[PDB]
Ligand binder design. Structure first.
Ligand SMILES: Cc1cc2nc3c(=O)[nH]c(=O)nc-3n(C[C@H](O)[C@H](O)[C@H](O)COP(=O)(O)O)c2cc1C
Length: 147
């Protein structure tokens, strides 16, 4: 199968998470395309992929804002080919904020509304992802066994 992983990441934590997932899928025999959100165009982005994984960190002062490179993709998610696509979401944040990984909820909700098939509940990482590597790999295992 072919998997696409798209991530928005400003300090590297969601990027590190995306690459650890990519390695686990690649070792399972997938062909994986891992792209930063800053370099992609929404139109038709998911065409051809068996599985799409979207990851983003959460920002904003008092509100929920998505990571800046991911905003344009989020705003044009209806042109990506998400209807009927198997997807799953992930993201890093910090539990001291009101909306812990609130970008993950906003993306899952928009996908569900477009008719995507959410394969597993979102992976939500608190603090340093390097200290939660076991959770990331476990989650990557679960999504692969699901689709
Ligand atoms: C100003 C600011 C607002 C933040 N807002 C949230 C938030 O609303 N919820 C959350 O879970 N984390 C929030 N964070 C934490 C970042 O998401 C966290 O540092 C994360 O690891 C960044 O991941 P990234 O390196 O992939 O961009 C915020 C951090 C800053 C500095």
């Amino acid at each position: 199968p072919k998997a696409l992983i798209v991530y928005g990441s400003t300090t590297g934590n969601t990027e590190y998470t995306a690459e650890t997932i990519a390695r686990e899928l690649a070792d399972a025999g997938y062909e994986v395309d891992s792209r930063d959100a800053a370099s992609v165009e929404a139109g038709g982005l998911f065409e051809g992929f068996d599985l799409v994984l979207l990851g983003c960190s959460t920002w904003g002062d008092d509100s929920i804002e998505l990571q800046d490179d991911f905003i344009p993709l989020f705003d044009s998610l209806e042109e990506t080919g998400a209807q009927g696509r198997k997807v799953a979401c992930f993201g890093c944040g910090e539990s001291s904020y009101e909306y812990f990984c609130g970008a993950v909820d906003a993306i899952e909700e928009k996908l569900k509304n477009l008719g995507a098939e959410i394969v597993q509940d979102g992976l939500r990482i608190d603090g340093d992802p390097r200290a939660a590597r076991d959770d990331i790999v476990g989650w990557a295992h679960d999504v692969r066994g699901a689709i």
